[PDB]
Design an enzyme around this catalytic site. Structure first.
Site, PDB file in Angstrom:
ATOM      1  N   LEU A 175     174.814   3.259  10.231  1.00 52.17           N
ATOM      2  CA  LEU A 175     174.407   3.293   8.819  1.00 52.17           C
ATOM      3  C   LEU A 175     173.809   4.645   8.476  1.00 52.17           C
ATOM      4  O   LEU A 175     174.065   5.186   7.402  1.00 52.17           O
ATOM      5  CB  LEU A 175     173.435   2.150   8.462  1.00 52.17           C
ATOM      6  CG  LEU A 175     174.036   0.737   8.395  1.00 52.17           C
ATOM      7  CD1 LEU A 175     172.939  -0.326   8.254  1.00 52.17           C
ATOM      8  CD2 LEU A 175     175.057   0.615   7.255  1.00 52.17           C
ATOM      9  N   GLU A 229     170.904   7.975  10.387  1.00 52.03           N
ATOM     10  CA  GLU A 229     170.041   8.461  11.463  1.00 52.03           C
ATOM     11  C   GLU A 229     169.073   9.492  10.909  1.00 52.03           C
ATOM     12  O   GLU A 229     169.290  10.060   9.838  1.00 52.03           O
ATOM     13  CB  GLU A 229     170.869   9.050  12.630  1.00 52.03           C
ATOM     14  CG  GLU A 229     171.807  10.209  12.263  1.00 52.03           C
ATOM     15  CD  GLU A 229     171.196  11.570  11.974  1.00 52.03           C
ATOM     16  OE1 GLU A 229     171.739  12.278  11.097  1.00 52.03           O
ATOM     17  OE2 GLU A 229     170.184  11.933  12.617  1.00 52.03           O
ATOM     18  N   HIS A 268     165.901  12.274  12.775  1.00 53.17           N
ATOM     19  CA  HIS A 268     165.000  12.692  13.843  1.00 53.17           C
ATOM     20  C   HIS A 268     165.372  12.044  15.196  1.00 53.17           C
ATOM     21  O   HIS A 268     166.486  12.265  15.672  1.00 53.17           O
ATOM     22  CB  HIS A 268     163.536  12.444  13.401  1.00 53.17           C
ATOM     23  CG  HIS A 268     163.147  13.256  12.206  1.00 53.17           C
ATOM     24  ND1 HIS A 268     163.650  12.978  10.938  1.00 53.17           N
ATOM     25  CD2 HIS A 268     162.373  14.361  12.137  1.00 53.17           C
ATOM     26  CE1 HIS A 268     163.149  13.910  10.147  1.00 53.17           C
ATOM     27  NE2 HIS A 268     162.378  14.765  10.824  1.00 53.17           N
ATOM     28  N   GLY A 318     165.640   8.677  15.811  1.00 52.41           N
ATOM     29  CA  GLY A 318     166.207   7.341  15.668  1.00 52.41           C
ATOM     30  C   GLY A 318     167.524   7.228  14.940  1.00 52.41           C
ATOM     31  O   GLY A 318     167.955   8.156  14.249  1.00 52.41           O
ATOM     32  N   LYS A 319     168.150   6.057  15.075  1.00 50.55           N
ATOM     33  CA  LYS A 319     169.402   5.721  14.404  1.00 50.55           C
ATOM     34  C   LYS A 319     169.360   4.282  13.916  1.00 50.55           C
ATOM     35  O   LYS A 319     168.746   3.418  14.549  1.00 50.55           O
ATOM     36  CB  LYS A 319     170.629   5.950  15.312  1.00 50.55           C
ATOM     37  CG  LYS A 319     170.720   5.004  16.528  1.00 50.55           C
ATOM     38  CD  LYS A 319     171.940   5.264  17.423  1.00 50.55           C
ATOM     39  CE  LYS A 319     173.271   4.903  16.791  1.00 50.55           C
ATOM     40  NZ  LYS A 319     174.351   4.758  17.794  1.00 50.55           N
ATOM     41  N   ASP A 373     158.336  11.758   4.331  1.00 49.58           N
ATOM     42  CA  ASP A 373     159.783  11.964   4.295  1.00 49.58           C
ATOM     43  C   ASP A 373     160.387  11.372   3.019  1.00 49.58           C
ATOM     44  O   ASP A 373     161.518  10.884   3.028  1.00 49.58           O
ATOM     45  CB  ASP A 373     160.427  11.389   5.585  1.00 49.58           C
ATOM     46  CG  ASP A 373     161.807  11.926   5.923  1.00 49.58           C
ATOM     47  OD1 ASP A 373     162.109  13.062   5.530  1.00 49.58           O
ATOM     48  OD2 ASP A 373     162.586  11.199   6.573  1.00 49.58           O
TER      49      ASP A 373
HETATM   50  N1  LIG Z   1     166.439   4.677   4.240  1.00 46.39           N
HETATM   51  C1  LIG Z   1     167.160   5.452   4.668  1.00 46.39           C
HETATM   52  C2  LIG Z   1     168.116   6.448   5.174  1.00 46.39           C
HETATM   53  C3  LIG Z   1     168.765   6.091   6.526  1.00 46.39           C
HETATM   54  C4  LIG Z   1     167.770   6.025   7.675  1.00 46.39           C
HETATM   55  C5  LIG Z   1     168.458   5.964   9.042  1.00 46.39           C
HETATM   56  C6  LIG Z   1     167.373   6.410   9.998  1.00 46.39           C
HETATM   57  N2  LIG Z   1     166.554   7.321   9.199  1.00 46.39           N
HETATM   58  C7  LIG Z   1     165.432   8.076   9.630  1.00 46.39           C
HETATM   59  C8  LIG Z   1     164.870   9.073   8.828  1.00 46.39           C
HETATM   60  C9  LIG Z   1     163.757   9.785   9.259  1.00 46.39           C
HETATM   61  C10 LIG Z   1     163.186   9.547  10.506  1.00 46.39           C
HETATM   62  C11 LIG Z   1     163.736   8.587  11.342  1.00 46.39           C
HETATM   63 CL1  LIG Z   1     162.986   8.331  12.886  1.00 46.39          CL
HETATM   64  C12 LIG Z   1     164.854   7.822  10.991  1.00 46.39           C
HETATM   65  C13 LIG Z   1     165.384   6.853  11.906  1.00 46.39           C
HETATM   66  N3  LIG Z   1     165.850   6.085  12.615  1.00 46.39           N
HETATM   67  C14 LIG Z   1     166.834   7.230   7.761  1.00 46.39           C
HETATM   68  N4  LIG Z   1     169.566   4.872   6.387  1.00 46.39           N
HETATM   69  C15 LIG Z   1     169.158   3.593   6.356  1.00 46.39           C
HETATM   70  C16 LIG Z   1     170.202   2.854   5.848  1.00 46.39           C
HETATM   71  C17 LIG Z   1     170.216   1.440   5.542  1.00 46.39           C
HETATM   72  N5  LIG Z   1     171.309   0.909   4.964  1.00 46.39           N
HETATM   73  C18 LIG Z   1     171.308  -0.408   4.732  1.00 46.39           C
HETATM   74  N6  LIG Z   1     170.330  -1.294   4.954  1.00 46.39           N
HETATM   75  C19 LIG Z   1     169.245  -0.733   5.528  1.00 46.39           C
HETATM   76  N7  LIG Z   1     168.084  -1.382   5.844  1.00 46.39           N
HETATM   77  C20 LIG Z   1     167.223  -0.472   6.409  1.00 46.39           C
HETATM   78  C21 LIG Z   1     167.788   0.763   6.425  1.00 46.39           C
HETATM   79  C22 LIG Z   1     169.106   0.625   5.869  1.00 46.39           C
HETATM   80  C23 LIG Z   1     171.207   3.799   5.611  1.00 46.39           C
HETATM   81  N8  LIG Z   1     170.838   5.019   5.942  1.00 46.39           N
END
Ligand SMILES: N#CC[C@@H]([C@H]1CCN(c2cccc(Cl)c2C#N)C1)n1cc(-c2ncnc3[nH]ccc23)cn1
Length: 297
Positions: A29, A31, A33, A35-36, A146
């Site tokens: 979906l 990522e 830093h 995490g993913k 962020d």
């Molecule tokens: N918000 C957002 C954007 C990204 C995440 C992905 C990770 N990220 C980070 C960012 C900074 C640090 C760190 Cl450590 C991380 C990490 N890991 C951001 N994202 C989440 C979905 C998504 N889509 C559908 N349902 C969802 N339910 C919860 C989330 C979600 C799609 N893109």
């Protein structure tokens, strides 16, 4: 006599405990830093009817403690405009965060695709919702660090939620800011001057980030109008390791991101109030909520 065994105690089921064996990966979906996040189906019945969930795991590379702290923060946040915690999957030191899945994704992909049905009135309602989620986070003594359109998820055409808390940090009781040590992957084009030069993170620093997020919302997250593209045009793009110092100098001079096309001046003035150089001088989230609500009348 007979072999002695253990009296089996009653096994109560925890709805926040997701067994690894039933947590089936569909696709990536996003990522950020360390995490993913992956789309999974939690399918205990094994017939593809299980609930779809978003699963945060560490990228293989340390950071287990950060993911556990994030789980504990999210588990205790309850707000209409904050992504819902569902549970955990435990390994064994390993852990995965289970959240609700929002099929419309982030504003970064959603807004360029839905410009025709999202007018100014809807953009201002999203701005209010982001401010409400942020004000709730601040009331629980946390700094997000962020805040950007990329981290705002779409629940429906009428509702958005802050979707990630990967960098969220607590502020101490009788303190005003968080001191950052690990800043190598900072989203510098969303950061307040005190974060870039003194490594201090205040609730007012999240207000600065909100101002930049509001600009993204008003430009429908167009890649050519992004905060990174605009600032790099202002200061120069090819500066490498000198980019942040050139950005700080530009902000000290009073230069800011321009008014988005078709954005009325009254909306732009609310955005500029997020960008006062001194944190004490910046608008609050509650003031922004009242400002937008007055424009929505
Ligand atoms: N918000 C957002 C954007 C990204 C995440 C992905 C990770 N990220 C980070 C960012 C900074 C640090 C760190 Cl450590 C991380 C990490 N890991 C951001 N994202 C989440 C979905 C998504 N889509 C559908 N349902 C969802 N339910 C919860 C989330 C979600 C799609 N893109």
């Amino acid at each position: 006599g007979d072999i002695v065994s253990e009296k089996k105690p009653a096994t109560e089921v925890d709805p926040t405990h997701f067994e690894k064996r039933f947590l089936k990966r569909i696709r990536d979906l996003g990522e950020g830093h360390f995490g993913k996040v992956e789309l999974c189906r939690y399918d205990p019945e094994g017939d593809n009817t299980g609930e779809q969930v978003a699963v945060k795991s560490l990228k293989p590379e340390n950071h287990i403690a950060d993911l556990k702290k994030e789980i504990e923060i999210l588990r205790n946040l309850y707000h209409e405009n904050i992504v819902k915690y569902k549970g955990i999957c435990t390994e064994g030191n390993g852990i995965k965060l289970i959240m609700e899945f929002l099929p419309s994704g982030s504003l970064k992909e959603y807004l360029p695709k839905n410009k025709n049905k999202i007018n100014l009135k809807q953009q201002l309602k999203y701005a209010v919702q982001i401010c409400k989620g942020m004000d709730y986070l601040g009331s629980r003594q946390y700094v997000h660090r962020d805040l950007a359109a990329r981290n705002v998820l779409v629940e429906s055409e009428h509702q958005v939620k802050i979707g990630d808390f990967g960098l969220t940090k607590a502020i101490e009781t009788d303190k005003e800011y968080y001191t950052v040590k690990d800043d190598r992957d900072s989203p510098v084009f969303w950061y307040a001057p005190e974060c870039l030069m003194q490594s201090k993170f205040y609730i007012a620093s999240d207000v600065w980030s909100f101002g930049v997020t509001l600009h993204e919302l008003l430009t429908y997250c167009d890649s050519d109008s992004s905060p990174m593209a605009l600032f790099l045009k202002m200061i120069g793009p090819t500066h490498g390791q000198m980019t942040v110092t050139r950005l700080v100098n530009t902000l000290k001079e009073g230069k800011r991101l321009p008014c988005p096309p078709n954005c009325p001046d009254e909306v732009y003035q609310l955005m500029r109030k997020c960008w006062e150089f001194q944190p004490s001088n910046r608008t609050s989230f509650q003031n922004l909520i009242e400002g937008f609500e007055a424009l929505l009348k």
